[PDB]
CSV table of C-alpha atoms in Angstrom, one decimal:
chain,number,residue,atom,x,y,z
A,122,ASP,CA,12.7,-1.9,-17.0
A,123,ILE,CA,11.9,-5.3,-15.7
A,124,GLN,CA,8.1,-5.6,-15.3
A,125,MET,CA,6.6,-8.1,-12.9
A,126,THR,CA,3.2,-9.7,-13.4
A,127,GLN,CA,1.3,-11.7,-10.8
A,128,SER,CA,-1.3,-14.5,-11.2
A,129,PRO,CA,-4.1,-14.5,-10.2
A,130,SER,CA,-5.1,-10.9,-9.5
A,131,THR,CA,-7.7,-12.0,-6.9
A,132,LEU,CA,-7.9,-15.3,-5.2
A,133,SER,CA,-10.5,-17.0,-3.0
A,134,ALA,CA,-9.7,-19.9,-0.7
A,135,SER,CA,-10.9,-21.2,2.7
A,136,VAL,CA,-8.8,-21.5,5.8
A,137,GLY,CA,-6.8,-24.6,5.9
A,138,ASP,CA,-6.3,-24.9,2.1
A,139,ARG,CA,-3.0,-24.8,0.3
A,140,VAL,CA,-2.8,-21.7,-1.9
A,141,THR,CA,-0.4,-20.5,-4.6
A,142,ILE,CA,0.6,-17.2,-6.2
A,143,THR,CA,2.7,-16.8,-9.3
A,144,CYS,CA,5.1,-14.0,-10.4
A,145,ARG,CA,6.5,-13.8,-13.9
A,146,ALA,CA,9.4,-11.5,-14.8
A,147,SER,CA,9.9,-10.0,-18.2
A,148,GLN,CA,13.5,-11.3,-18.1
A,149,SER,CA,15.5,-13.6,-16.0
A,150,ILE,CA,16.1,-12.1,-12.5
A,151,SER,CA,18.1,-15.2,-11.3
A,152,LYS,CA,17.0,-15.8,-7.7
A,153,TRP,CA,16.7,-12.1,-6.7
A,154,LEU,CA,13.0,-12.0,-5.9
A,155,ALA,CA,11.3,-11.0,-2.6
A,156,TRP,CA,7.7,-11.4,-1.4
A,157,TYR,CA,5.9,-8.8,0.7
A,158,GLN,CA,2.6,-9.0,2.5
A,159,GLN,CA,0.4,-5.9,3.0
A,160,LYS,CA,-2.6,-5.9,5.4
A,161,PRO,CA,-5.5,-3.4,4.8
A,162,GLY,CA,-4.5,-0.1,6.3
A,163,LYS,CA,-1.0,-1.2,7.3
A,164,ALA,CA,2.4,-1.0,5.7
A,165,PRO,CA,3.9,-3.9,3.7
A,166,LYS,CA,5.8,-6.6,5.6
A,167,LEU,CA,8.8,-8.4,3.9
A,168,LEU,CA,8.0,-12.2,4.0
A,169,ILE,CA,10.7,-13.7,1.7
A,170,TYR,CA,13.9,-12.7,0.0
A,171,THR,CA,16.2,-14.4,-2.4
A,172,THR,CA,13.3,-16.5,-3.7
A,173,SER,CA,13.1,-19.0,-0.7
A,174,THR,CA,14.8,-17.5,2.4
A,175,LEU,CA,12.2,-16.7,5.0
A,176,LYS,CA,12.5,-13.5,7.0
A,177,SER,CA,12.8,-14.1,10.8
A,178,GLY,CA,9.4,-14.3,12.5
A,179,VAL,CA,7.5,-15.4,9.4
A,180,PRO,CA,5.6,-18.7,10.1
A,181,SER,CA,6.8,-21.7,8.2
A,182,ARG,CA,3.5,-22.2,6.4
A,183,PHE,CA,4.9,-19.7,3.9
A,184,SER,CA,7.4,-20.9,1.3
A,185,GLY,CA,8.8,-19.4,-1.9
A,186,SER,CA,10.0,-21.4,-4.9
A,187,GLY,CA,10.8,-21.0,-8.6
A,188,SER,CA,13.7,-19.5,-10.4
A,189,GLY,CA,14.7,-17.5,-13.5
A,190,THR,CA,11.4,-16.2,-14.9
A,191,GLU,CA,8.7,-18.0,-12.9
A,192,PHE,CA,8.3,-17.8,-9.2
A,193,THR,CA,5.7,-19.1,-6.7
A,194,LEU,CA,4.7,-18.1,-3.2
A,195,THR,CA,2.9,-20.9,-1.3
A,196,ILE,CA,0.8,-20.9,1.9
A,197,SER,CA,0.6,-24.4,3.3
A,198,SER,CA,-2.5,-24.0,5.6
A,199,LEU,CA,-4.3,-20.7,5.2
A,200,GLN,CA,-4.9,-19.0,8.5
A,201,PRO,CA,-7.0,-16.2,9.9
A,202,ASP,CA,-4.3,-13.5,9.9
A,203,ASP,CA,-3.2,-14.5,6.3
A,204,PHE,CA,-5.8,-12.4,4.3
A,205,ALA,CA,-3.9,-9.6,2.7
A,206,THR,CA,-2.5,-8.4,-0.7
A,207,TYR,CA,0.8,-10.0,-1.6
A,208,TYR,CA,3.4,-8.2,-3.8
A,209,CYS,CA,6.6,-9.6,-5.3
A,210,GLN,CA,9.6,-7.4,-6.0
A,211,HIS,CA,12.8,-8.2,-7.9
A,212,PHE,CA,16.0,-6.8,-6.5
A,213,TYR,CA,18.0,-7.7,-9.6
A,214,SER,CA,19.0,-4.1,-10.1
A,215,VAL,CA,17.5,-0.6,-10.2
A,216,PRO,CA,14.8,0.3,-10.9
A,217,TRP,CA,13.2,-1.9,-8.3
A,218,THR,CA,9.7,-2.9,-9.5
A,219,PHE,CA,6.8,-4.7,-8.0
A,220,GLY,CA,4.0,-6.9,-9.3
A,221,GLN,CA,0.4,-5.6,-9.6
A,222,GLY,CA,-0.6,-7.5,-6.4
A,223,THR,CA,-2.6,-10.5,-5.5
A,224,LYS,CA,-5.4,-9.9,-2.9
A,225,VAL,CA,-6.3,-13.3,-1.3
A,226,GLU,CA,-9.8,-13.7,0.1
A,227,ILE,CA,-11.0,-15.9,2.9
A,228,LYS,CA,-13.9,-18.1,1.7
A,229,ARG,CA,-16.8,-18.7,4.1
A,230,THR,CA,-20.4,-19.9,4.0
A,231,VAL,CA,-22.5,-17.7,1.8
A,232,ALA,CA,-24.2,-14.9,3.8
A,233,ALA,CA,-27.0,-12.6,2.9
A,234,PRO,CA,-26.8,-8.9,3.7
A,235,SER,CA,-28.9,-7.1,6.2
A,236,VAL,CA,-30.1,-4.0,4.4
A,237,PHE,CA,-31.0,-0.7,6.0
A,238,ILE,CA,-32.2,2.6,4.5
A,239,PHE,CA,-31.6,6.1,5.9
A,240,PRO,CA,-33.6,9.1,4.8
A,241,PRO,CA,-32.0,12.6,4.4
A,242,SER,CA,-31.4,14.5,7.6
A,243,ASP,CA,-33.2,17.8,8.2
A,244,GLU,CA,-29.9,19.6,8.5
A,245,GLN,CA,-28.9,18.5,5.0
A,246,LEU,CA,-32.3,19.5,3.6
A,247,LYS,CA,-31.7,22.9,5.0
A,248,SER,CA,-28.7,23.1,2.7
A,249,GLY,CA,-30.6,22.2,-0.5
A,250,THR,CA,-29.6,18.6,-1.0
A,251,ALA,CA,-31.0,15.2,-0.1
A,252,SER,CA,-29.0,12.1,0.6
A,253,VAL,CA,-30.7,8.7,0.9
A,254,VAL,CA,-28.3,6.1,2.2
A,255,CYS,CA,-28.6,2.3,1.6
A,256,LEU,CA,-26.5,0.0,3.7
A,257,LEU,CA,-25.7,-3.7,3.0
A,258,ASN,CA,-24.2,-5.3,6.1
A,259,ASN,CA,-22.5,-8.7,6.5
A,260,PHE,CA,-22.6,-10.5,3.2
A,261,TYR,CA,-20.3,-12.9,1.4
A,262,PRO,CA,-19.4,-13.1,-1.4
A,263,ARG,CA,-18.9,-9.4,-2.0
A,264,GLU,CA,-20.5,-9.4,-5.5
A,265,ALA,CA,-23.7,-7.7,-4.3
A,266,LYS,CA,-25.8,-5.5,-6.6
A,267,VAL,CA,-27.8,-2.4,-5.5
A,268,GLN,CA,-30.3,-0.3,-7.5
A,269,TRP,CA,-32.1,2.9,-6.6
A,270,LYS,CA,-35.8,3.2,-7.2
A,271,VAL,CA,-37.8,6.4,-6.8
A,272,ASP,CA,-41.5,5.9,-7.3
A,273,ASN,CA,-40.6,2.6,-9.0
A,274,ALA,CA,-38.3,4.4,-11.4
A,275,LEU,CA,-34.7,3.2,-11.7
A,276,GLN,CA,-32.0,5.8,-11.2
A,277,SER,CA,-28.8,6.2,-13.2
A,278,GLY,CA,-25.7,8.3,-12.8
A,279,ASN,CA,-27.2,9.2,-9.5
A,280,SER,CA,-25.4,7.1,-6.8
A,281,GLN,CA,-22.0,6.2,-5.4
A,282,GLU,CA,-21.2,3.0,-3.4
A,283,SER,CA,-18.2,1.9,-1.4
A,284,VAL,CA,-17.4,-1.5,-0.1
A,285,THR,CA,-15.2,-2.3,2.9
A,286,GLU,CA,-12.3,-4.7,2.8
A,287,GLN,CA,-13.0,-8.2,4.2
A,288,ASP,CA,-13.9,-8.2,7.9
A,289,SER,CA,-11.4,-9.8,10.3
A,290,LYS,CA,-13.8,-11.7,12.6
A,291,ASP,CA,-16.6,-13.0,10.3
A,292,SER,CA,-14.9,-12.4,6.9
A,293,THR,CA,-18.0,-10.5,5.7
A,294,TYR,CA,-18.3,-7.4,3.6
A,295,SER,CA,-20.4,-4.2,3.9
A,296,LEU,CA,-21.3,-1.6,1.3
A,297,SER,CA,-23.0,1.8,1.5
A,298,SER,CA,-24.6,3.3,-1.6
A,299,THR,CA,-25.5,7.0,-1.4
A,300,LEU,CA,-28.2,8.4,-3.7
A,301,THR,CA,-28.2,12.2,-3.7
A,302,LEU,CA,-30.7,14.6,-5.3
A,303,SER,CA,-31.5,18.2,-4.8
A,304,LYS,CA,-34.0,19.5,-2.3
A,305,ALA,CA,-36.2,20.5,-5.3
A,306,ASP,CA,-36.5,17.2,-7.1
A,307,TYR,CA,-36.3,15.2,-3.9
A,308,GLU,CA,-39.5,16.8,-2.7
A,309,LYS,CA,-41.1,15.9,-6.0
A,310,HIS,CA,-41.4,12.2,-5.3
A,311,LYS,CA,-42.9,10.1,-2.4
A,312,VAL,CA,-41.3,6.6,-2.0
A,313,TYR,CA,-37.6,5.8,-2.1
A,314,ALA,CA,-36.3,2.2,-2.2
A,315,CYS,CA,-33.0,0.4,-2.8
A,316,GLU,CA,-33.5,-3.0,-4.3
A,317,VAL,CA,-30.6,-5.4,-3.6
A,318,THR,CA,-29.6,-8.7,-5.2
A,319,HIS,CA,-27.1,-11.2,-3.9
A,320,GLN,CA,-26.2,-14.8,-4.3
A,321,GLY,CA,-27.4,-15.6,-0.8
A,322,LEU,CA,-30.7,-13.8,-1.4
A,323,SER,CA,-33.1,-16.3,-2.9
A,324,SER,CA,-35.0,-13.3,-4.5
A,325,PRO,CA,-34.2,-9.6,-4.6
A,326,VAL,CA,-35.0,-7.7,-1.4
A,327,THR,CA,-36.3,-4.1,-1.2
A,328,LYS,CA,-36.1,-1.6,1.6
A,329,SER,CA,-38.0,1.6,1.2
A,330,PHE,CA,-39.7,4.5,2.9
A,331,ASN,CA,-42.3,7.2,2.2
A,332,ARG,CA,-41.5,10.8,3.0
B,736,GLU,CA,12.8,-1.6,17.9
B,737,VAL,CA,13.3,-0.2,14.4
B,738,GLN,CA,10.7,2.6,14.0
B,739,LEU,CA,10.3,5.1,11.1
B,740,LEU,CA,8.1,8.2,11.1
B,741,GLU,CA,7.4,10.1,7.9
B,742,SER,CA,6.2,13.7,8.0
B,743,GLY,CA,5.7,16.6,5.6
B,744,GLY,CA,2.9,15.3,3.5
B,745,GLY,CA,-0.2,17.3,2.6
B,746,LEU,CA,-2.0,19.2,-0.2
B,747,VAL,CA,-0.1,21.1,-2.8
B,748,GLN,CA,-0.9,22.6,-6.2
B,749,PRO,CA,0.5,21.2,-9.4
B,750,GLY,CA,4.0,22.4,-10.3
B,751,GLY,CA,4.6,23.0,-6.6
B,752,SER,CA,7.2,21.6,-4.2
B,753,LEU,CA,7.1,19.7,-0.9
B,754,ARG,CA,9.7,18.1,1.4
B,755,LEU,CA,9.2,14.9,3.4
B,756,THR,CA,11.4,13.8,6.3
B,757,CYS,CA,11.8,10.4,7.9
B,758,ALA,CA,12.8,10.3,11.5
B,759,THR,CA,14.5,7.1,12.7
B,760,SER,CA,15.4,5.7,16.1
B,761,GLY,CA,16.1,2.0,16.4
B,762,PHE,CA,19.2,1.4,14.3
B,763,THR,CA,22.6,2.9,13.2
B,764,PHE,CA,21.4,5.2,10.4
B,765,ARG,CA,24.9,5.5,9.1
B,766,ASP,CA,25.3,2.0,7.8
B,767,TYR,CA,22.0,1.3,6.0
B,768,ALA,CA,20.6,2.2,2.6
B,769,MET,CA,17.2,4.0,3.0
B,770,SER,CA,14.4,4.1,0.4
B,771,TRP,CA,11.2,5.9,-0.5
B,772,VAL,CA,8.3,3.9,-1.9
B,773,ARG,CA,4.9,5.2,-2.8
B,774,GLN,CA,1.4,3.7,-3.0
B,775,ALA,CA,-1.3,5.5,-4.9
B,776,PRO,CA,-4.9,4.8,-3.8
B,777,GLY,CA,-6.3,1.4,-4.7
B,778,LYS,CA,-3.1,0.6,-6.5
B,779,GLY,CA,0.2,-1.2,-6.1
B,780,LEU,CA,3.6,-0.3,-4.7
B,781,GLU,CA,6.0,1.9,-6.7
B,782,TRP,CA,9.6,2.4,-5.7
B,783,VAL,CA,10.5,6.1,-5.7
B,784,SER,CA,14.1,6.5,-4.6
B,785,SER,CA,17.0,4.8,-2.8
B,786,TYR,CA,20.1,6.2,-0.9
B,787,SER,CA,23.0,3.8,-0.8
B,788,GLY,CA,24.6,2.6,2.4
B,789,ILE,CA,28.2,2.6,1.2
B,790,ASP,CA,28.5,6.1,-0.3
B,791,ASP,CA,26.4,9.0,-1.7
B,792,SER,CA,24.9,7.0,-4.5
B,793,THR,CA,21.3,8.0,-5.3
B,794,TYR,CA,18.8,6.0,-7.4
B,795,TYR,CA,15.5,7.4,-8.8
B,796,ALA,CA,12.5,5.9,-10.7
B,797,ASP,CA,12.3,7.1,-14.3
B,798,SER,CA,9.0,8.9,-13.8
B,799,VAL,CA,10.6,10.8,-10.9
B,800,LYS,CA,14.1,11.4,-12.3
B,801,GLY,CA,15.1,15.1,-12.5
B,802,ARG,CA,12.3,16.2,-10.2
B,803,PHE,CA,12.8,14.6,-6.8
B,804,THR,CA,16.0,14.4,-4.8
B,805,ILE,CA,16.7,12.1,-1.8
B,806,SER,CA,19.0,13.5,0.9
B,807,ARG,CA,20.5,11.9,4.0
B,808,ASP,CA,21.3,13.4,7.4
B,809,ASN,CA,23.4,10.9,9.5
B,810,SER,CA,23.5,13.4,12.4
B,811,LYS,CA,19.7,13.6,13.1
B,812,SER,CA,19.4,10.1,11.4
B,813,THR,CA,16.8,11.4,9.0
B,814,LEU,CA,15.9,10.8,5.4
B,815,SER,CA,14.5,13.6,3.3
B,816,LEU,CA,12.7,13.6,0.0
B,817,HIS,CA,12.6,16.9,-1.9
B,818,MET,CA,9.7,16.9,-4.4
B,819,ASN,CA,9.5,19.6,-7.2
B,820,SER,CA,7.4,20.2,-10.3
B,821,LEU,CA,4.8,17.9,-8.6
B,822,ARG,CA,2.4,16.2,-10.9
B,823,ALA,CA,-1.1,14.8,-10.5
B,824,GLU,CA,0.2,11.3,-10.7
B,825,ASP,CA,2.6,11.9,-7.7
B,826,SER,CA,-0.4,11.8,-5.4
B,827,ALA,CA,0.0,8.8,-3.1
B,828,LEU,CA,1.0,7.5,0.3
B,829,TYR,CA,4.8,8.0,0.7
B,830,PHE,CA,6.5,5.3,2.8
B,831,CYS,CA,10.0,5.4,4.2
B,832,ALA,CA,11.8,2.1,4.1
B,833,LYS,CA,14.9,0.5,5.6
B,834,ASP,CA,17.2,-2.1,3.9
B,835,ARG,CA,17.4,-5.5,5.6
B,836,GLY,CA,21.2,-5.4,6.1
B,837,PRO,CA,23.9,-2.7,6.4
B,838,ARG,CA,26.2,-1.5,3.6
B,839,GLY,CA,23.8,-2.2,0.8
B,840,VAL,CA,22.1,-0.3,-2.0
B,841,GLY,CA,18.4,-0.6,-0.9
B,842,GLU,CA,17.5,-3.9,-2.5
B,843,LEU,CA,14.9,-4.8,0.1
B,844,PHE,CA,12.4,-2.9,2.2
B,845,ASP,CA,12.6,-4.6,5.6
B,846,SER,CA,11.1,-2.0,7.9
B,847,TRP,CA,8.5,0.5,6.8
B,848,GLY,CA,7.0,3.6,8.3
B,849,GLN,CA,3.2,4.3,8.5
B,850,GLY,CA,3.4,6.7,5.5
B,851,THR,CA,2.6,10.3,4.8
B,852,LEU,CA,-0.1,11.2,2.3
B,853,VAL,CA,0.6,13.6,-0.6
B,854,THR,CA,-2.3,15.0,-2.6
B,855,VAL,CA,-1.5,17.1,-5.7
B,856,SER,CA,-4.5,19.1,-6.9
B,857,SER,CA,-5.5,22.7,-7.6
B,858,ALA,CA,-8.7,22.0,-5.6
B,859,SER,CA,-9.2,24.0,-2.4
B,860,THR,CA,-9.3,22.5,1.1
B,861,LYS,CA,-12.9,22.2,2.2
B,862,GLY,CA,-14.1,20.9,5.6
B,863,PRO,CA,-16.7,18.2,5.6
B,864,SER,CA,-20.4,18.5,6.4
B,865,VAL,CA,-21.5,15.8,8.9
B,866,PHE,CA,-25.1,14.6,8.8
B,867,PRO,CA,-26.7,11.9,11.0
B,868,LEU,CA,-27.9,8.6,9.6
B,869,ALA,CA,-30.8,8.3,12.1
B,870,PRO,CA,-32.5,4.9,12.6
B,871,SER,CA,-36.1,3.7,12.4
B,872,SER,CA,-36.8,0.4,10.6
B,873,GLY,CA,-35.1,-2.3,11.7
B,874,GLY,CA,-33.4,-5.7,12.2
B,875,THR,CA,-31.0,-5.3,15.1
B,876,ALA,CA,-30.0,-1.6,14.7
B,877,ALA,CA,-28.2,0.6,12.2
B,878,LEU,CA,-26.8,4.0,13.0
B,879,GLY,CA,-24.5,6.2,10.9
B,880,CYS,CA,-22.9,9.5,10.0
B,881,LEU,CA,-22.4,10.9,6.4
B,882,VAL,CA,-19.3,13.0,6.0
B,883,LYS,CA,-19.9,15.0,2.8
B,884,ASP,CA,-18.1,17.3,0.4
B,885,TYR,CA,-14.6,17.5,1.8
B,886,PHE,CA,-11.1,17.7,0.3
B,887,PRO,CA,-8.4,16.4,0.6
B,888,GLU,CA,-8.7,12.7,1.6
B,889,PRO,CA,-7.5,12.2,5.2
B,890,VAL,CA,-10.6,12.0,7.3
B,891,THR,CA,-10.9,9.8,10.5
B,892,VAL,CA,-14.0,8.9,12.5
B,893,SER,CA,-14.5,7.2,15.8
B,894,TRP,CA,-17.7,6.6,17.7
B,895,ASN,CA,-18.4,7.8,21.3
B,896,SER,CA,-14.8,9.0,21.3
B,897,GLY,CA,-12.8,5.8,21.3
B,898,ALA,CA,-15.3,3.9,23.5
B,899,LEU,CA,-17.5,2.3,20.8
B,900,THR,CA,-15.7,0.2,18.2
B,901,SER,CA,-17.6,-3.1,18.2
B,902,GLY,CA,-19.9,-3.5,15.2
B,903,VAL,CA,-18.5,-0.4,13.5
B,904,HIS,CA,-17.9,-0.2,9.7
B,905,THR,CA,-16.2,2.9,8.4
B,906,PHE,CA,-16.2,3.1,4.7
B,907,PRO,CA,-13.7,4.2,2.1
B,908,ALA,CA,-14.4,7.7,0.7
B,909,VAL,CA,-15.8,7.9,-2.8
B,910,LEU,CA,-15.0,10.8,-5.1
B,911,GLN,CA,-18.1,12.7,-6.2
B,912,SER,CA,-18.7,14.2,-9.6
B,913,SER,CA,-17.9,17.6,-8.1
B,914,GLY,CA,-14.3,16.8,-7.2
B,915,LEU,CA,-15.1,16.2,-3.5
B,916,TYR,CA,-15.0,13.2,-1.2
B,917,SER,CA,-18.0,11.6,0.5
B,918,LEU,CA,-17.6,9.1,3.4
B,919,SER,CA,-20.0,7.2,5.6
B,920,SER,CA,-19.3,5.6,9.0
B,921,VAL,CA,-21.8,3.2,10.5
B,922,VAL,CA,-22.3,1.2,13.7
B,923,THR,CA,-24.9,-1.6,14.4
B,924,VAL,CA,-26.1,-2.0,17.9
B,925,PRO,CA,-29.0,-4.2,19.3
B,926,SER,CA,-32.5,-2.9,19.1
B,927,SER,CA,-32.9,-3.1,22.9
B,928,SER,CA,-29.8,-0.9,23.4
B,929,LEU,CA,-31.2,2.1,21.4
B,930,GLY,CA,-32.9,3.7,24.3
B,931,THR,CA,-30.2,3.6,27.0
B,932,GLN,CA,-27.1,4.9,25.4
B,933,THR,CA,-26.2,7.9,23.3
B,934,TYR,CA,-24.3,7.7,20.0
B,935,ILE,CA,-21.9,10.5,19.0
B,936,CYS,CA,-19.8,10.1,15.9
B,937,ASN,CA,-16.4,11.9,16.1
B,938,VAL,CA,-15.4,13.1,12.7
B,939,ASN,CA,-11.9,14.6,12.2
B,940,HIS,CA,-10.4,16.3,9.2
B,941,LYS,CA,-6.9,17.8,9.8
B,942,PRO,CA,-6.2,19.4,6.4
B,943,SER,CA,-8.9,22.0,7.3
B,944,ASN,CA,-8.4,21.7,11.0
B,945,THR,CA,-12.0,20.6,11.5
B,946,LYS,CA,-13.4,18.4,14.4
B,947,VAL,CA,-17.1,17.6,14.7
B,948,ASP,CA,-18.8,15.6,17.4
B,949,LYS,CA,-22.3,14.8,16.1
B,950,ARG,CA,-25.1,13.1,17.9
B,951,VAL,CA,-27.4,10.8,16.0
B,952,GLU,CA,-30.9,10.5,17.4
B,953,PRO,CA,-33.6,8.2,16.0
B,954,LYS,CA,-36.2,9.3,13.5
C,1048,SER,CA,29.9,11.1,-12.1
C,1049,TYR,CA,29.0,7.4,-12.1
C,1050,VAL,CA,27.1,5.5,-9.4
C,1051,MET,CA,27.6,2.2,-7.6
C,1052,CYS,CA,26.3,-1.0,-9.2
C,1053,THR,CA,23.1,-2.5,-7.8
C,1054,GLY,CA,23.4,-5.8,-9.5
C,1055,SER,CA,25.4,-9.0,-8.7
C,1056,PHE,CA,28.6,-10.3,-10.1
C,1057,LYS,CA,29.1,-13.8,-11.4
C,1058,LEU,CA,32.5,-15.3,-10.9
C,1059,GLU,CA,34.4,-16.8,-13.8
C,1060,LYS,CA,38.1,-17.3,-12.8
C,1061,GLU,CA,40.3,-16.6,-9.8
C,1062,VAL,CA,44.0,-17.2,-9.9
C,1063,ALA,CA,47.2,-16.0,-8.1
C,1064,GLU,CA,50.1,-13.7,-8.8
C,1065,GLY,CA,51.8,-11.9,-4.9
C,1066,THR,CA,48.3,-10.7,-5.9
C,1067,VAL,CA,45.0,-12.0,-7.1
C,1068,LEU,CA,43.0,-11.7,-10.3
C,1069,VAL,CA,39.2,-12.1,-10.6
C,1070,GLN,CA,37.1,-12.1,-13.7
C,1071,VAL,CA,33.5,-11.1,-13.2
C,1072,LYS,CA,30.5,-10.6,-15.5
C,1073,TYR,CA,27.8,-8.3,-14.3
C,1074,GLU,CA,24.1,-9.1,-14.0
C,1075,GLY,CA,22.2,-5.8,-14.1
C,1076,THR,CA,20.5,-3.1,-16.1
C,1077,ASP,CA,22.0,0.0,-14.5
C,1078,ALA,CA,25.4,-0.1,-16.3
C,1079,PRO,CA,27.7,1.8,-16.6
C,1080,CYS,CA,28.2,1.8,-12.9
C,1081,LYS,CA,31.0,1.8,-10.3
C,1082,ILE,CA,31.9,-1.6,-8.9
C,1083,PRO,CA,31.5,-1.8,-5.1
C,1084,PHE,CA,34.8,-3.5,-4.3
C,1085,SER,CA,35.7,-4.0,-0.6
C,1086,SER,CA,38.0,-6.2,1.4
C,1087,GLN,CA,37.1,-7.6,4.8
C,1088,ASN,CA,45.6,-3.9,4.5
C,1089,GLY,CA,43.6,-4.9,1.3
C,1090,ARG,CA,44.2,-2.8,-1.8
C,1091,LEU,CA,42.7,-2.6,-5.3
C,1092,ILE,CA,45.4,-2.3,-8.0
C,1093,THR,CA,42.7,-1.9,-10.7
C,1094,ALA,CA,41.9,1.9,-10.9
C,1095,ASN,CA,38.3,2.9,-10.9
C,1096,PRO,CA,36.7,-0.6,-11.4
C,1097,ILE,CA,33.6,0.1,-13.6
C,1098,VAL,CA,31.1,-2.1,-15.5
C,1099,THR,CA,30.1,-0.7,-18.9
C,1100,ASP,CA,28.1,-3.7,-20.3
C,1101,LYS,CA,26.3,-6.7,-19.0
C,1102,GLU,CA,27.7,-8.9,-21.8
C,1103,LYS,CA,31.3,-7.8,-21.2
C,1104,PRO,CA,33.4,-9.3,-18.4
C,1105,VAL,CA,35.6,-7.2,-16.1
C,1106,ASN,CA,39.1,-7.9,-14.8
C,1107,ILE,CA,39.8,-7.0,-11.2
C,1108,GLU,CA,43.2,-7.4,-9.6
C,1109,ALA,CA,43.5,-7.0,-5.8
C,1110,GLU,CA,46.4,-7.2,-3.3
C,1111,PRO,CA,45.0,-8.8,-0.1
C,1112,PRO,CA,47.0,-9.2,3.1
C,1113,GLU,CA,43.0,-14.6,5.9
C,1114,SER,CA,40.1,-12.4,4.8
C,1115,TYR,CA,37.3,-12.2,2.4
C,1116,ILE,CA,37.2,-10.3,-0.9
C,1117,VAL,CA,33.7,-8.8,-1.3
C,1118,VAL,CA,32.9,-7.7,-4.8
C,1119,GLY,CA,29.4,-6.3,-4.9
C,1120,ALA,CA,27.1,-5.1,-2.2
C,1121,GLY,CA,23.9,-6.0,-0.4
C,1122,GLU,CA,22.0,-9.3,-0.4
C,1123,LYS,CA,24.0,-10.7,-3.3
C,1124,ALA,CA,27.5,-9.4,-2.8
C,1125,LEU,CA,30.0,-12.0,-4.1
C,1126,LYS,CA,32.0,-13.1,-1.0
C,1127,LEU,CA,35.3,-14.9,-1.5
C,1128,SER,CA,38.2,-15.8,0.8
C,1129,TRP,CA,42.0,-15.8,0.2
C,1130,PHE,CA,45.5,-16.2,1.6
C-alpha cells in the first residue's frame, strides 16, 4: 500500500511564526492529498483536500502546496488554537493511509516546575501498599527529569510518570510520577524525596518528607 | 448540523466478537459513503472500512480483511461494524466518519463522531481504588486523587462535581507492571483557600459501574 | 463479484460517432474494479466497464441524449459535457 511519512515528527514554534509540515508518499498520488487537524481529546477535523483546496470555515492562514510525491502544509501566523497533531491522508485509492502525525508545540518563555510531594494515604496503607506521588506543575519545555530517592538511595524499576498534553492558557506541562512500594518495605525507611531537574531550574530541586 | 454517535464499544476477550453502530441525524444517509477509522492509544489514524455511496461496495483494510464487515441501514440511517476474531491489536478508539460529498466512495472523512473505545484483553474488569493526595507543604496549594488498579481504560474524574475546573490537571493513565491502569487527578488552589472550601474528587468508571466521591482533607 | 473503482480516470481521447467514445487510463491500486460510469436518457453501450490494470487504457462508448458524462466518483470524478 501507499505509505505516507511526515516530517518533522514533533515541531516547536512560537505564536506568530510561519511553520511548515511535509508529507512524502511512497509513490505519486497526483494531487489527491488531504490534511486533517486533531486537537487533544477531540476528533480530527478535515482542513484541506485535493492538496490546496481549503475546507469551508478553515482560516486562511492555512495553505497546502506540493504535488506528486512531496507535499507541504503551511501555517502563516501561528495562533493559540493552532496547537494540535496534523495528519495527512492520500485519497488516491483504497486502502486510505495516513502519515504518522506531526504534533506542533507552542513555544513560550522557559518556566520552572512547582514541585509537590504527597505521602501515602492511611486507607492505602491499610491495603498493604504505599504510593508516594511527586507532581511537577507548570513547566516548559516538557523535557523534565524526575528521580526517586529513599534514604538518599536512587530507585529503579519502581515508578511510573505521566505528562499532560500542552496546556491551552499558559502552554505549560505537568507530570506526576508515582513511586509505589509495599507496606513492608515502605515502613523500612524514613525519608522520601523526588529530585527534579529541568532547563529552567538553575540547580536540581528536591522535595522530601520524613514519615 | 451533521452529528454522528458511535455506540457498542467495550471490553471483549480475544477471538471474541463485537458490533458497533453509528447513529446519524443531520444529513441524507442514503447518498453518502460512510467510513470507520480507528486510533489506538498514543498512535496515529488507521482507516478500517468504507461503505460506498453509489452501491453496496465495501472496502476493508488488509489487517482487518476477512474479520470485520461494514453494514448499512438507510432506514434508521445507521452504520454498523461487525467485528469478529478480535485481536489484541484491534484495541483502539473507533470513529465513524462521513464523506465530504454525496455519491462517493469514502475518500475523505469530513465529519467525525466522538468515538467508541474497544479494549481486547483477557484481563478482568476491576473497579479502581481512589486514594486522597492530601496537602501539607507548600507553594500555593496542591490537592489530588490517585485512581489505582483498574481495568479497562475509560475513567473520568471531575472535582466538586462539575463546579471546580480552574487549575485542574487530570493525567493520562499509565499501565502498571500488573496489567492495570493507574491515574492521578490534581487541582491547585491558593493557600488561603484551603480552610474555607471542601474538595471532593468525583471518579467514575463505567466498565465496572463504579462511582466514587472522595473527600481530600489535609495532612 | 467485483467492486467499484476508488481511483481517478485520466482522459486521453474523446471523439464522436451518433455516440461518443472515451479512452481513459486508470490511476489506482485497487484494480480490477468496476468503473463508476454515470450520466447527468443516457446509456452505456460498453457492457460491464471494468479496469484490470493501471497501465492499460480502457475504451468506453456512451450514447448521451446538454449534459455531463461523469466517469469516476467522488472528489476526483472526471466530469465532461456533450451534445
